Amino acid sequence: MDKSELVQKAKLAEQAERYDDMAAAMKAVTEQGHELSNEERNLLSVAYKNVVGARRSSWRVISSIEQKTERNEKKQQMGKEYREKIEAELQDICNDVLELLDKYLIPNATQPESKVFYLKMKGDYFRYLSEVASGDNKQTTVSNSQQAYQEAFEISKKEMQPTHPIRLGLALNFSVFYYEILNSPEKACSLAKTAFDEAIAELDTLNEESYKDSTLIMQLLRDNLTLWTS
Amino acid sequence: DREDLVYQAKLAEQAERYDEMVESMKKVAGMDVELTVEERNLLSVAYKNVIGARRASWRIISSIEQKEENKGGEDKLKMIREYRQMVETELKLICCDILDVLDKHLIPAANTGESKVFYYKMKGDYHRYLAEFATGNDRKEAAENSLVAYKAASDIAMTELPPTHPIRLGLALNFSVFYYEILNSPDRACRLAKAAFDDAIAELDTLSEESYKDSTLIMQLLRDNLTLWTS
C-alpha cells in the first residue's frame, strides 16, 4: 500500500478513536526509511502514547489491588498473575517503539529539533519500562533513560531557543525522571526552576503562535514545582 | 471455578479490560445454571462496553464519509468505505457471540420471571444493534427478530413484574426507542412510552426511598424521549 494511504488511514483511525489501528499504520509508514515530517512525527507520537497509556493505567489499578488484598492467599495468587499479564503487554509496546527509534528514526535524523524529539521519546519509553521493572533490570533501564535525556539536553541547551515548546517539553519530562524514578527531588526542583526562569526572561522575543504552546507547557512546570515545594 | 471466574471478571472490570471480562463471564454463562443478580449484571456490563466502543467509532466513520461524499475523491471514499466495513465486521462478531450464548445456554435454563424478562431484553437489544448498520434483506430479518424478542419480554413482564420495576421500565424505554429508530413509527414509540410512564405514576407512593430513586431515574428518561419525539 502507498505511503499517502497509510497516513490517511492513521488520520481516520485517530478520529474514530481506534489507537491500536493508528499505531500499526504509523509503524508501517516509519519502516519505509524516509525521514518523517512534523505531521507524521505527531501521528506516530500520539498513536503510541495512547497505546501505552491504557496499560500504565490498568497496571496501577491491579498493582494497587495486590497491595490492598493483604488478608487472603488464594486471592493474592490470582492478583499477581493478572498484574504480570498486563506488565508483559506494557514491556512489549515499549520495546516495539524503542526498536523504531534505534533502527530507523534516530540514525536517519540529521537536524537538532528532530534529534531532540526522538531522544526525548527514547528517554520516555525507558522511563515507562522503569515504572514496572525490578532488580538489576530496573538499574539497567534507569541508566538507559538518563543517557537518552542528557544527550537531548546537551543538544537542546545549545541548538534551540530557550522558549521553544520542545525545549520546555524536554525540561518538564527530565525533571519528572529525577523526582519519581531517581527519587532526587532537589535535582527536579533546580532543573524545573532553571528551565522556567530561562523561558520567562525571553517571552518578549516570542510570537503569539509559539507563545500559546510555550505558556501552556510552562504552567505545568510551575504546577510540578508547586506540588513538590508544598 | 464459578466463584473465581466471577473474581477474574471483577478484576478485568476495574482494569477496564472488557474483552477479558467477556471471556471470564462467557465461561460462567456456559454452565447451564441460574445466574445470580450480580452475575447477570457482570455479563451485561461486559458485552455492553465491548459493543459500545465499536458503535461509537462506526457513527464517527459514517459521519466522515457523508462529509467526504460532497464531491470528494472516489479513491479517498473507497479507503473510508473499506475502513467502515472492517468496523461493521467486528459488530457482527460481537453480536453473534452473545446471541448464541443467550439462545443455547441462558434463555432455556432460566427459572424465574425476572430472569426471562432480562434475557429476552438482551436478545432484543443485540438483534437491534445489527439493524442499525445492516441494509436490504438483513435489516428486515434483524428488525423482525428484535420485535419478536421485545414482545416475548413484554408478555411475561405483565404477569411477573410491577409496573414501577426497573426491568419493566427499562424494557418499555428500549422497545419504544426500537419503534422510533429501527421501524420508524414515531406514533407507536410515543404511545408505548406514554403508557408505561402513566402505569408507573399510579404506584410510586407504595415504594421505599431506595426503590423510588431507582424507578424514577428510568421514568425521567421516558419523559425526555417523549419531550423530544413530540416536537
Place this chain on the structure above:
Amino acid sequence: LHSPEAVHTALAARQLQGLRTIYARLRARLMGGHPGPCHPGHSFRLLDSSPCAESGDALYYRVVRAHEDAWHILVAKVPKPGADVPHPWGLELQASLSPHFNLQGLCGLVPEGTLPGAPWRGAVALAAEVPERTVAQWLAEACTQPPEEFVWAVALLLLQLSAALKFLEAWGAALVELRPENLLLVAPRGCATTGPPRLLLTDFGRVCLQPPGPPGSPGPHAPQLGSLLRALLSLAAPSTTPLAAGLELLAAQLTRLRPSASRTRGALQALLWGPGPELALGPWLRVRRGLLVLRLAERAAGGEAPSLEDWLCCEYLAEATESSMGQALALLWD
C-alpha cells in the same frame, strides 16, 4: 379550541387513558384476595370429607388456613391414583410462576401427618382458587341452550384459553394435549354468578419445554386448538349465525396455517367485537371505544356492576391498533 383536529385528538387520547384506567381498576378487584405462600406460623383444618370438585387428574377438598385471626379457603389438590404424569418439569413450572388470571397458582403444601383422618396420605399441594366444574361437565349441561347463546359462551371460553397458551408460548413451553376434563371453571371475584365463568388451565403435568425456533416456524398449539374448537361446535344445533360460521372458518385456518396463540387471540376478539368482513379502521376504533365507555356509565347509573365480558372487551379495545386488526381480518378472511 377553534381547531377541530385538536379537539378530536385530545378526546381520543383521554378516552384511551380512561379505558386503561377502567381495565386496571376491574383487574385489581378480579385479582384481589389471592392468599400469600404458606408459613411455619399457619395452621390447617378440613371442611370436606368428599371432594368439592373432581378433575380428570385430581380431587379437590376445601382446607381452611388460619393465622392470628386472619384466614383463607384453599383446596388440597390430591392426585387421582393410577394417573400418568408425562412431564414433571411442568409441575416445577407451576410452582415458579406469579399469579395469572387463567393459570392455576399454588400457595404451598400440607406436609405428611398434619390433618388426622384425612382422605389422602403423604404431602399435597394447596391451590389458591376453589373450582365449580370442569369444562367437560359444563358442556353436558350448556349444550341444551339455544345455539346463539351456547356459541357465545364457547367463544368466550376459547378467548380465555388462548391467553393462557399465549403466556406459555412466550415463556417457551407447550401442552402436549388439550383435554376439557382438565380445564376448570371458577366464579369471578366480586361479580354476579350468572355472568361468564373464569377459566383455569391446570394440567401442568403435560407442559414441556418447547424451544421457540425461527420467526417463520409453526405455532405449537394450533392443531390442538383447531381440534378442540370443532369438538365444541359439534354439540351446537346448526344455525346460519355469523359467529358460528366465523368460528368454523377460524377452525379451518388454525389447522391449515398453524398461527401462534397471539394471532389466534386476535381473530377471536375480531369475531366477538371487531371489524366485520366489510372493513377506515382508525375512525372505527375511536367510535367503538366511545360506545363502550357509554355502556359502562349508563349501567353504573342503573346500579349494575361491570361483568367479566365487559372487562374482556375493555382489554381488546384498549390494546387494538390498525395493524393488529388488519392482521386479524387477514387471518380470518384470507
Place this chain on the structure above:
Amino acid sequence: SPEAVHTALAARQLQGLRTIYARLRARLMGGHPGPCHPGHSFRLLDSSPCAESGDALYYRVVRAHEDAWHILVAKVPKPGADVPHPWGLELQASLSPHFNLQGLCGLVPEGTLPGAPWRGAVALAAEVPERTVAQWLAEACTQPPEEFVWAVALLLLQLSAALKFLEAWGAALVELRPENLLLVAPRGCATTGPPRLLLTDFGRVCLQPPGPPGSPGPHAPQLGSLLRALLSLAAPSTTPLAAGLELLAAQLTRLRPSASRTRGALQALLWGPGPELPWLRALGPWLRVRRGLLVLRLAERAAGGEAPSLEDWLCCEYLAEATESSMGQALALLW
C-alpha cells in the same frame, strides 16, 4: 369523514346523559309513600323530637295497609309558631312531588296515636328529616373546612331550583330563613357528600300574578342577603369560587334577576365556563369536550365500585339541558 363521525358521537353522547339523569332521578326519587286511605293503620316509633326546626317539631311514624309498610313523619306545629299565608299550607298539599320541596302524604287524626305528645290532627311528610341548614351551619362554623364554600354553593344551587319551581308556578316565598330549611340523606347514594335540601316553609308563600318583570325575581334580594350571611360566616377568600360568589351577591341586589337566571350563574361558578375561556363563540366545542369528560368520570368510578354522588347527578342535569344561549346569559350576569 370526521364531520359525520363527531356529529354522530355528539348526538349519541347527549342521549347517554339524558338516560343517566333519568336512571339516577328514578333512584333518588324512589321509595316515596303514596296517599293515605281509610284501610290504613299506624304505630309511633319514638317519644321525643326526631327533628326540630324554627316553626315545626317532627315525630316518626309507621304506616301499614294490606300488609304494605312505610315510614313517614308527623309535622307538629312548634308552640308559638304562626302562619302569615294559610293559602300556602293549601299549596303544599296541591303541588306535585319535587326533589327539593317538603311534600305531604296525608293526615293523622287524634286517637289514632293517643300515646303521642300531640293532640288534634297532624299532617305527615314523605321524607325523614336529619337537621336544619342553621344546625349544619352550627357544626360548620365550629370546624369550617377550606371546602365549606363548595358545600354552601351546592346547597344554594338546590335552593334556587326550589325557588325556580315557585316562580314557574303562580307563587313566591315571602321570607327566607335557614332555621326552617331541612337536610336529608340521598336515597341509595349516601356518603360524606352533599345532602338533599328540602324547602319547608309553606306557611310564608303567596300568589304572584304580574306578567311584566317588576323586580325580575321576587326572591333575588333575599338570596343576596342569605348568600352574604353565608359568605360573612365563612372564612376569607382562598379559592376563586369565593370571589365569584361575592361578585354574584352584589349583582343579585343590583339587578334582582329571576331565580331561573340565578340558578344558571351558580351552575357556571361550579362547572360552567368563565372569563378564562371570544367567550360567546367557543361554547359549542366546549360543551362537546365537557360532556365527554363527565361520561368518562362516571365510568372510572364504576370500575372503582363507587356509586354516583348527588354532586354527580346535579352536574349531569346542568350539562344535559345546557345551551349556548343559556350559558351566555349566565356569563353576562356573573361578568
Place this chain on the structure above:
Amino acid sequence: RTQSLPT
C-alpha cells in the same frame, strides 16, 4: 439524541 438505558 434519543436515549436507551445506561450501565
Place this chain on the structure above:
Amino acid sequence: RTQSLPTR
C-alpha cells in the same frame, strides 16, 4: 498528581 507532557 505530578504532570508529564500531555498527549497532543
